[PDB]
Symmetry: C3
Subunit: 334 residues, 3 copies
Amino acid sequence: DWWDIPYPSQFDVKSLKTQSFISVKGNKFIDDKGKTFTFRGVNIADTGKLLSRNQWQKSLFEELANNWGVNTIRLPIHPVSWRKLGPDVYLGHIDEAVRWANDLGIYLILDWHSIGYLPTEQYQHPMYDTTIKETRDFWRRITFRYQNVPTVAVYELFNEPTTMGNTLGERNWAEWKTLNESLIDMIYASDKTVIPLVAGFNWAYDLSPIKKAPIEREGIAYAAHPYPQKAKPEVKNDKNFFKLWDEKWGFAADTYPVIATQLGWVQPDGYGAHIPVKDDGSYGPRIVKYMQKKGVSYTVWVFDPDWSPTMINDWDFTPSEQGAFFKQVMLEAK
Amino acid sequence: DWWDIPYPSQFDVKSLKTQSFISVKGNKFIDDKGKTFTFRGVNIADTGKLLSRNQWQKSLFEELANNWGVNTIRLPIHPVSWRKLGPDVYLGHIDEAVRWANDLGIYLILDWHSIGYLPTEQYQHPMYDTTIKETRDFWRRITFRYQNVPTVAVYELFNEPTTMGNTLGERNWAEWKTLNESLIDMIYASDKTVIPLVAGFNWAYDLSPIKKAPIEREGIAYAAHPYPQKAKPEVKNDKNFFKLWDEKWGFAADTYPVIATQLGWVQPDGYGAHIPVKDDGSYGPRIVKYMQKKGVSYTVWVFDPDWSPTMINDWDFTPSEQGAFFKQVMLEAKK
Amino acid sequence: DWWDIPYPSQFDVKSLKTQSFISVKGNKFIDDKGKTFTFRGVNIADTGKLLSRNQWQKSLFEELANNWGVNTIRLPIHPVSWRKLGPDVYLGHIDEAVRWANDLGIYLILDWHSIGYLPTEQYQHPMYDTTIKETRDFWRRITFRYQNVPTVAVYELFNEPTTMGNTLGERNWAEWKTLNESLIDMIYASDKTVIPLVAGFNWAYDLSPIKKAPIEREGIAYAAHPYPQKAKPEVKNDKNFFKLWDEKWGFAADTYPVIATQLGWVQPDGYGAHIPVKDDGSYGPRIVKYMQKKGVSYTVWVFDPDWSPTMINDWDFTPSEQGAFFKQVMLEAKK
Ligand SMILES: OC[C@H]1O[C@@H](O[C@@H]2[C@@H](O)[C@H](O[C@H]3[C@H](O)[C@@H](O)[C@H](O)O[C@@H]3CO)O[C@H](CO)[C@H]2O)[C@H](O)[C@@H](O)[C@@H]1O
Ligand SMILES: OC[C@H]1O[C@@H](O[C@@H]2[C@@H](O)[C@H](O[C@H]3[C@H](O)[C@@H](O)[C@H](O)O[C@@H]3CO)O[C@H](CO)[C@H]2O)[C@H](O)[C@@H](O)[C@@H]1O
Ligand SMILES: OC[C@H]1O[C@@H](O[C@@H]2[C@@H](O)[C@H](O[C@H]3[C@H](O)[C@@H](O)[C@H](O)O[C@@H]3CO)O[C@H](CO)[C@H]2O)[C@H](O)[C@@H](O)[C@@H]1O
Ligand SMILES: [Cl-]
Ligand SMILES: [Cl-]
Ligand SMILES: [Cl-]
Ligand SMILES: [Mg+2]
Ligand SMILES: [Mg+2]
Ligand SMILES: [Mg+2]
């Protein structure tokens, strides 16, 4: 009976091992000792996808923390999967991820993984289909359930804003800014210790509107998705890419913390190769060098053998080209 | 086939016995003889809840009218129930309530029983979940079906506006005012004889925004839900509560008709006790005295043995503490 | 698995026979040689309705093009049918219509066939029920699939705006204008060769708001639904109807292209007769004379034996009164 449906419960924070909160101070993330923190890690696939092949397990997290040097895992929660499993079930699985991550001393970025234009509720693909109401409700539920949980560090409000050349709507920064501020207000009303992560247009590549009209809230970080072909210099070299990246997203790191929550590549003739993830490999050192210089955090896309570009070729964790590259980088940084 | 789906019908007004319309005149409700009218009654549970236990029957209405002195029943129509039964079936059951009430000479308040912030479509619990579209459609259907039915006196547009400390959205009077005016306009387009009832924030407790920006429509009344702990004076007495109630909602009765569509209490250690319905009992005489002085109408929450705070302890209508208290008050007022 | 659902594909334009695009220039439609073009044709029923009785077939289009003189068919896509068949299946059937029409050298008007007020998402009947999100998605999908297809000439954004005497919402031209501009922008982003068709209030009858506040986009045309009883002169004659039609919709043809996407009549005591389609027959020559004089395009409602007013009495295409009349008119004009 509907009148017997219980009110929701909050995650039991006393079940967790000690773990520092991460907070925003100026243009940096810091831990509870004031030491500069950098999120360095990977995306995994949607929980529902992993469950379907029996790969949603602690052993996945252990492999990453122990053998790949990650301090962060990004969970891309697809709206279609949220609906298919249903909120109560999906949240129960996120609880498992919180416990596994906490046990390993690593952090989670929760990503509402849609692609398109939320103000008009039009999207790149139905797997990303959502509504303002559903998006608000997702964040209402998440914020309430994970109040005062250090393991869950970042709430990435909407993965990839895009109008696909204004076919989905008319991109308008003021309208998108206002909507992010509305989401932030709902979150901050319920938990002020979380870090909202806000994205610009062109699939979370273009942060340039924040130069004139930044989000008017404190404690936030900005996303960037600097895939190799987002910048298109006529001549491909460090100088030309750095200038282009500087103007579109890199500048943000001077004033706000930035997380490159998606990056990576595959050979142009490789598995699942498509624009804008095609590259000969020179991008890897280039993007790492740039991020290092700017102090930018990152989560590689994606630690999965099916979704591309892959970091692994199988569920024995055989590394792909980009996987082998980032594995060495992250292990050195740890 | 979808192209064969028939257009809706209206309630047959000729099936009803003679009953006066209630109308708004200034700060008062009046009957068709211009005599001041006060709604005095109770809430019952959602129709779907009552149906599930075979308690949706005329005998319920008869008990209330004959033995509890009510002239009004408030039906709190939960959106989840509206969806579960479906509009056509739910409306058929509301038709039954109209006939029963009309036969007894009593009135109905139809309440779109949601709790939360409609402009962002975020709510306290999924049982209240709705949308602006669904809310409009509810009032479109209701207004059409019950055109020119005196028995259905009041359309209470949205039970309890709240943002739950701005966790549901940013409370904003201007946007809420505009949305109520939109709903009123749809209703008045279809039936001008109905009384819309409009609520403020803090779970329909705070009417103070209407001092500066009242709804810009005539013929309306304002709701109040003055539960015992909504006002929180340091020292609990008549003087201190009256002052607080005056500033938040009582003042409205000087200019507009007011209906306290929810009120009541249970002991702090009693069944279903929670903030803000906890009280030692002194509230009962206090709220009745205040409403009497201001000429405020009321429907007690709730005449049900499960939902709290209860007016009855069972379906034999054994009165609870607050039930026994309000029963005597209403029976006296009916005289 | 949801992650394996493929991305959509576009119609194969190389499968089509040569056919001129139609474009807007000033107050006229023109072909690719700059010659003035007039859409002259009929509505058929919703694809889903036709499928249910096995009447969705090329032979329908052939009958119309060969024997009724049409150069245009309007497809009224009902939202309930779009949902029932589902977008992928419905689009597959529209692909059939594109091929059939193209093979015959005729054109299609795609009509999102709702009746009501999209800004509040309230409608005359559930078969028309939709949302802004669904309406946008329909046009997103259509525009992408039929990019660079000359056969599909017109995208009629929303069949019949009405608030039904403000029972559905408060009619507001600025709000409706803005929403049409938003739809136009999504379409033009994906295909600039299409012609959007925009409607006014009173069931797409009243274009008068465009005198002061026209849609601020180029390449658009305006719809009119001049059913016989939309204008109500005291004395029914050419002079009095022409004056009324001039003021409400005819004036638009002086500045913009106009398509009367619905028109027609049945005797007042005839099959499916209702306001505002009732007429003695004198309307037929009258509306044709008016349109001819103004250079207005048209699609008669409706070439179906069930939906009214009918152009045919059966699926052997036995003409009704209005069908016989318009058949002769269209056949002559095709010369
Ligand atoms: O799902 C099986 C199917 O998956 C394809 O992988 C897709 C990924 O490539 C895709 O990654 C994209 C991100 O989701 C976006 O945020 C970003 O803009 O673009 C990324 C790619 O550049 O994610 C989806 C799920 O969201 C995956 O379906 C494989 O490429 C394909 O081989 C396989 O059949
Ligand atoms: O439903 C089963 C569950 O019911 C609980 O009763 C609830 C009522 O206490 C509740 O009353 C509230 C109103 O609905 C609100 O408008 C108002 O803000 O506060 C009232 C007092 O809380 O209504 C809900 C349904 O809307 C009832 O479910 C019982 O407390 C519980 O024991 C029982 O199992
Ligand atoms: O479908 C079965 C039922 O259909 C009725 O036909 C209806 C048509 O008359 C109706 O046409 C209207 C248009 O849809 C509107 O755009 C316009 O304002 O008015 C037209 C005529 O009044 O369309 C609906 C479907 O949209 C049809 O149902 C038959 O008249 C009836 O006998 C039959 O049982
Ligand atoms: Cl964009
Ligand atoms: Cl509130
Ligand atoms: Cl209208
Ligand atoms: Mg946290
Ligand atoms: Mg009434
Ligand atoms: Mg075209």
